[PDB]
Design a protein that fits this description.
PDB class: antimicrobial protein
Bound molecules: adenosine-5'-triphosphate, magnesium ion
Organism: Homo sapiens
Protein name: E3 ubiquitin-protein ligase RNF213
Structural class: alpha/beta
Subcellular location: Cytoplasm, Cytosol; Lipid droplet
Strand content: 5-15%
Helix content: 40-55%
Number of helices: 36
Oligomer: part of a larger assembly
Family: Belongs to the AAA ATPase family.
Length: about 1000
């Protein structure tokens, strides 16, 4: 009965169709209040723009007819008699229901009935401006349900064309247009159709139902039925309706039910026409104080896009914010940054992040909403931007609504997702171009170039001055960069950096990192004596020139990309690592990764410490080499042959650590480990993010822990937070861990003067890798800037992008009854590759990280054997087994790992964790070796010698049977390969198999 009542009241009052059941309840409970919630006022603004309490009041007069109040009085008088006239609870309940449907305000005095609400809404509408008079384009018959079919790429602009016929009229909203989706409910479509057909309106408006093919079967059927019913009853005969669908889905329910109404003249408009339309409808009057006053013809909506990453979108938004703070002459201008991370845009989260700004203090104050559409977002962008920028609205299932205010400036930072034209082209677009294009093409705020705050910054100036005096072969000995000084032009700086960057078409991020490295190095130089007219005299000549020529190479190592559908790796060992540091003491200089050798040419060259091959030549002159030798600078050192404590001292010196305490005597401080530690520390110092790619077990966690402990010096303090990222990891979790790490770093820095390290293990195993990109590159958390001067350092670990062998893939597809889904129907995939065919379940890397990722290196057989020996010795320390047993275990486990590595058709992943697991199994069997062997002898005696068994070898055989044997299908080959390392008579595969089988039989017995 109440559903029929609401349908009748909607047919009676037209504006009740602007809102749903819950929204109507909210308005009923809120309109009577004083003042109504800002949310309700916004919801009403979709009828009477800029609705205020005064307007709601002026509309509230005339609604309370004393006829309705007379109904209220007679109800409040009769209801008790009607109740006592009945005795059955059900009868009283029915009477109460009926009397509430007749007069609700009697029961609920703090609420408005549907009649009063409809009247108030109609009054508000009349209190508004002139109505909207839209005329359908040609090919669409007024009074008929014009069905337009087209391509997805044209579904949105087509609708737009329908509303450009009358461009003078304002842009539509949810009242007219509805972007259908599979989750769209019948209520929204019903309200749309009722608004289209029901009578009571004050103008002629078009009503569009876009992507109708996406509506569910039930919803489409209900919409058709409701449309027919509305057509039967009293309605609008000149109703302008459009129904757009995807030609690829013209076979669904709704496009079919109106197939007879299909239209062949699909509306279309030139991109320039749409541009002018949207621009004129976004332009803010000079009198309306808006954030748009500083954006491209006073436009309230903008797009900052780029073909690639690291080009200046967020920087453009920041400079805009600064321009607004400086121009509008207001003390504060909010800047709300919204990061979209979900692959499918979640409009609910954006609406929640926006709601706080519905307050009245913001409805007339400039604001800058910075919507960042990350690379993770794949579907839902066009619909979202159409809803928020053209339809200027957002909504949720609850009922809350958000309206786009012209006083606010919406800026979308999106990477071009490359029809005749792209969607984003319709909006006012600012295309940020990289340096190469910036120097080739070139002022125009639509095509920005090289910022001035950066060009005038030390980071870009000191390297620039040095390189400028370098290419001109000027005397760098006397030159000294003056703080704040500025020279040259952005063009020369760009040219020099591109010449020395080591990259063909770099981004602004790569160039910034190169500049930061060079600047940090040259500054740590100038702070020393070697490059000073005093403390030496003229002993060191060309020192600055050598420093530059070598730091360019160091930066080629620290900045050039290491990654190049799934092809992403170059390697770590294939590249040298010539590192030169200026120690914090300002007295010593550390050299590592290369050896300086003179030659016949009276020059000096850098050669690999391992191969002796030349890395680069003419790095310096023989005179400078001899001078630095006189200065006792370490050259051609072999850190591998040094003592442990000497290595620790040199390392803590380079890192500026004064103490030299070894926190872990087991960690081998080979040259490569120290080089990696120094790379991380340099990236921390110069400000470059640290994103490391390495297999599990390559030694990254251990290295990071060692570095943290070493910088600790023993001081008890949680200076490291190791967050293990998994598929279930979310953005909020990452932000929370980052904030916790920030607080901890503040505490540690103000107590012990230490630096905290937040490490992300397996970062690329979640869809929230964009949050990590923000924490590292953007230096922000959920839109909030990370507090500098916190001593916090972030590290990210990304697993490799590998694919199982075709043989292993076929073996898995053939397991059991095979995968329930096919490799074609799988929704989980990294583009075209199903995630189930990758070794590591990883997700695409944000483009801004790929140039930063580098390889930690694959564990060499030597390191594998050393770690295995360490594990077996740690075991011996408890089980107390002889040396022969240790040797046998080490050999058998190394051989097992080698076999599983060779067997790329059965195993594509090998790590030390499997070794630890096999050791744990061996220990378990050893502890139970006595009882197990006794029961085994008993079980063998029952069913039929003794053949005494060594508990160690027996346990090891069972452990190999559990870990490797069982999983394998080539068990015979594995046994043949592994028995060689077994003592006698256990060097026979058949004996391994027999012992495994006997243990299994015992267990099953
Ligand atoms: N003229 C410039 N344009 C852009 N960036 C510059 C410029 N000069 C220096 N930089 C540095 O380059 C970096 C550019 O980062 P930016 O915020 O533009 O990335 P982005 O455009 O958001 O890319 P993505 O959205 O893919 O991360 C900044 O950290 C900035 O310090
Ligand atoms: Mg950005």
């Amino acid at each position: 009965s109440w559903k029929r009542f609401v349908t009748q009241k909607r047919m009676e009052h037209f504006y009740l169709n602007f809102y749903t059941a819950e929204q109507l309840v909210y308005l009923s409970t809120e309109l009577r209040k004083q003042p109504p919630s800002d949310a309700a006022l916004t919801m009403l603004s979709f009828i009477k723009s800029n609705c205020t309490l005064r307007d709601v009041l002026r509309a509230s007069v005339g609604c309370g007819s004393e006829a309705a109040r007379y109904r209220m009085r007679r109800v409040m008088e009769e209801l008790p008699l009607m109740l006592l006239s009945e005795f059955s609870l059900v009868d009283k309940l029915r009477i109460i229901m009926e009397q509430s449907m007749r007069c609700l305000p009697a029961f609920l005095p703090d609420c408005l009935d549907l009649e009063t609400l409809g009247h108030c809404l109609a009054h508000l509408a009349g209190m508004g401006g002139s109505p909207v008079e839209r005329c359908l384009p040609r090919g669409l018959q007024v009074g008929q349900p014009n069905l337009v079919v087209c391509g997805h790429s044209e579904v949105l602009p087509a609708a737009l064309a329908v509303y450009m016929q009358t461009p003078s009229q304002p842009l539509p909203t949810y009242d007219e247009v509805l972007l259908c989706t599979p989750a769209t409910t019948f209520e929204e479509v019903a309200l749309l159709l009722r608004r289209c057909l029901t009578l009571g309106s004050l103008g002629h408006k078009v009503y569009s139902l876009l992507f109708a093919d996406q509506l569910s079967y039930e919803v489409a059927r209900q919409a058709e039925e409701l449309f027919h019913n509305l057509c039967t009853q009293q309605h609008r005969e000149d109703y302008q309706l459009v129904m757009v669908c995807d030609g690829d889905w013209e076979h669904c329910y709704l496009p079919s039910a109106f197939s007879q109404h299909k239209v062949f003249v699909t509306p279309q408009a030139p991109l320039e026409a749409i541009q002018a339309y949207l621009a004129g409808h976004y332009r803010v009057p000079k009198q309306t104080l808006s954030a748009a006053a500083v954006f491209n013809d006073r436009l309230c909506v903008g797009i900052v896009a780029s073909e690639r990453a690291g080009v200046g979108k967020s920087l453009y938004v920041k400079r805009l914010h600064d321009k607004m703070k400086m121009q509008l002459n207001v003390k504060n201008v909010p800047l709300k940054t919204i990061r979209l991370i979900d692959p499918q845009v979640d409009e609910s989260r954006v609406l929640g992040a926006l709601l706080p700004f519905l307050d009245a203090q913001y409805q007339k104050v400039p604001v800058l909403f910075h919507l960042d559409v990350t690379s993770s977002v794949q579907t839902g962008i066009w619909v979202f931007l159409f809803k928020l920028l053209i339809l200027q609205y957002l909504m949720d299932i609850n009922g809350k609504m958000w309206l786009r205010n012209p006083c606010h400036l919406y800026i979308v930072e999106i990477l071009e997702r490359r029809p005749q034209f792209s969607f984003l082209d319709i909006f006012p677009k600012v295309t940020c171009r990289p340096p190469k294009e910036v120097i080739d093409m070139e002022r125009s705020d639509t095509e920005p170039g090289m910022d001035l705050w950066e060009f005038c910054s030390e980071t870009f100036q000191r390297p620039y001055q040095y390189l400028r005096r370098f290419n001109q072969n000027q005397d760098l000995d006397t030159f000294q960069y003056q703080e704040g000084s500025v020279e040259g032009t952005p063009e020369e700086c760009l040219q020099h950096f591109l010449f020395h960057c080591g990259v063909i078409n770099p981004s602004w991020s790569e160039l910034r990192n190169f500049a930061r490295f060079l600047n940090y190095q040259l500054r740590d130089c100038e702070a020393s004596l070697f490059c000073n007219p005093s403390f030496i005299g003229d002993t060191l000549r060309g020192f600055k020139k050598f420093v530059v020529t070598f730091m360019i190479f160091m930066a080629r190592d620290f900045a050039t990309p290491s990654l190049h559908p799934f092809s992403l790796r170059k390697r770590w060992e294939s590249e040298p690592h010539p590192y030169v540091f200026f120690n914090d003491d300002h007295t010593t200089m550390t050299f590592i990764g290369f050896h300086l050798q003179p030659n016949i040419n009276g020059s000096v060259d850098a050669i690999s410490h391992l191969t002796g091959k030349v890395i680069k030549r003419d790095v310096m002159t023989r005179d400078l080499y001899q001078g630095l030798l006189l200065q006792r600078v370490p050259f051609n050192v072999d850190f591998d042959k040094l003592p442990r404590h000497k290595k620790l001292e040199r390392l803590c010196l380079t890192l500026g650590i004064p103490q030299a305490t070894d926190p872990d005597k087991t960690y081998e401080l080979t040259t490569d480990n120290m080089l990696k530690i120094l790379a991380i520390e340099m990236r921390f110092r110069c400000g470059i993010p640290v994103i490391i790619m390495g297999e599990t077990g390559c030694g990254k966690t251990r290295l990071i822990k060692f570095l943290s402990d070493l910088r600790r010096g023993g001081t008890n303090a949680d200076t490291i937070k190791l967050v293990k990222v998994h598929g279930g990891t979310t953005a909020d979790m990452i932000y929370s861990r980052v904030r916790e790490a920030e607080n901890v770093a503040f505490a540690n820095k103000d107590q012990h003067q230490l630096d905290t390290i937040l490490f992300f293990d397996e970062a690329n195993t979640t869809e929230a890798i964009s949050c990590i990109k923000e924490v590292l590159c953007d230096h922000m958390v959920d839109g909030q800037p990370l507090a500098e001067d916190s001593g916090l350092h972030i590290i990210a670990a990304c697993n490799p992008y590998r694919k199982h062998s075709e043989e292993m893939i076929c073996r898995l597809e053939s397991a059991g009854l095979g995968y329930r889904v096919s490799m074609e129907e799988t929704a989980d995939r990294l583009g075209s590759i199903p995630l189930r065919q990758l070794v590591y379940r990883v997700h695409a890397l944000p483009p801004s990280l790929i140039p930063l990722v580098w390889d930690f290196g694959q564990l060499s057989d030597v390191a594998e054997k050393l770690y295995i020996q360490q594990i077996v010795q740690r075991l011996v320390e408890s089980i107390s087994l002889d040396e022969n047993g240790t040797r046998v275990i080490t050999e058998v486990l190394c051989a097992s790992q080698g076999f599983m590595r060779k067997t790329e058709d059965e195993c594509s992943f090998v790590s030390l964790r499997d070794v630890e697991r096999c050791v744990k199994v061996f220990r378990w069997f050893h502890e139970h070796s006595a009882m197990l062997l006794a029961q085994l002898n008993a079980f063998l005696s029952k069913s039929s010698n003794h053949t005494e068994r060594d508990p160690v070898l027996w346990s090891l055989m069972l452990a190999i049977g559990v870990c490797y044997h069982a999983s394998l299908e080539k068990k015979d080959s594995y046994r043949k390969a592994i028995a060689r390392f077994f003592p006698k008579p256990y060097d026979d595969s058949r004996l391994l198999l027999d012992e495994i089988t006997r243990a299994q039989d015992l267990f099953l017995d």
